[PDB]
Design a protein around this ligand. Structure first.
Ligand SMILES: C[N+](C)(C)CCO
Ligand SMILES: [Cl-]
Ligand SMILES: [Zn+2]
Length: 296
């Protein structure tokens, strides 16, 4: 320690900037303060980071236990634990996967044991159409009409990667039903409480996303009409294709920025592809000291 400085946005405004962060020398109290900032301000932007893939993973290890993405075509060639979103060929070759996350989601929401913190280290940044959209789903919950809160009290949601699973080079010439069935076998839909208590802040989080949440079920386990999910998506801002809804936060960044955010509370998505500008980003996803929620 001796130089890390966190500047939190005032009041209820989302976000914080962190200057002078060096993951190799930060103290234990520094890391604890940074983590408190992530859980309360939801997005911490580390400034002036110039890291190799190896150093990026080491930074993530300061915060928690990294997990490699379960489909290895997304993995960085040198560091299995880095997820690569890229549409810039490297010597003509495709590294990682292009056009990822073009839908509202929380990371690993379709898995039984989602990690609590996501780190994004942008490498190639669109000049004009840059940034990632975010919605804080605890704040979104609080802003729901009281009756809508009542309607989802006691319900459960099913989450699945089945809509957005990407065809892999190995899948060419396979019948489509075989892949559909493989996805159900490898990543069966996961049931979660529709709302859960955030272990670090105590706040109630509405844990749904247009991208991964495929059904809602009652406190007896019987499916409810998906019109309820549409009304929740609509109320929380996830159906607004203009991205002007009051819940929506556009997070921009510049070279050297490294975003760390609360993957319990937030959902995020890429912007519309309104320009041909490329994107390359490295992702590290870590488990912190608690499960997603205490029922996991
Ligand atoms: C990387 N995501 C899990 C967000 C989508 C890929 O299907
Ligand atoms: Cl994910
Ligand atoms: Zn994501």
């Amino acid at each position: 320690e001796g130089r890390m400085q966190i500047d939190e946005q005032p009041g209820n405004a989302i976000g914080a900037a962190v200057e002078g962060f060096d993951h190799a020398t930060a103290s234990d109290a520094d890391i604890d303060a940074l983590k408190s900032t992530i859980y309360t301000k939801k997005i911490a932007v580390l400034k002036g980071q110039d890291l190799s893939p190896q150093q990026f993973l080491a930074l993530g290890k300061r915060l928690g236990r990294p997990e490699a993405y379960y489909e290895p075509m997304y993995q960085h060639p040198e560091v299995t634990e880095i997820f690569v979103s890229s549409n810039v060929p490297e010597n003509g070759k495709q590294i990682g996967v292009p056009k990822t996350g073009k839908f509202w989601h929380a990371d690993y929401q379709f898995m039984p044991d989602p990690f609590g913190i996501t780190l994004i280290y942008p490498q190639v940044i669109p000049e004009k159409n840059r940034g990632t959209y975010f919605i804080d789903m605890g704040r979104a919950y609080d802003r729901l009409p009281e009756d809508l809160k009542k309607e989802i009290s006691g319900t459960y949601c099913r989450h699945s990667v089945r809509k957005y699973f990407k065809i892999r080079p190995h899948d060419v010439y396979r019948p489509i039903s075989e892949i559909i069935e493989e996805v159900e076998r490898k990543t069966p839909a996961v049931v979660q409480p529709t709302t859960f208590t955030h272990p670090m802040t105590g706040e109630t989080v509405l844990y749904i996303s247009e991208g991964f949440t495929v059904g809602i079920e009652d406190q007896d386990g019987k499916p409810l009409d998906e019109e309820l999910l549409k009304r929740l998506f609509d109320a929380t801002g996830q159906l607004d294709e203009s991205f002007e809804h009051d819940n929506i936060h556009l997070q921009s960044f510049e070279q050297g920025d490294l975003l760390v955010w609360d993957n319990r509370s937030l959902i995020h998505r890429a912007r519309h592809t309104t320009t041909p500008e490329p994107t390359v980003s490295y992702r590290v996803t870590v488990h912190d000291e608690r499960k997603l929620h205490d029922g996991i």
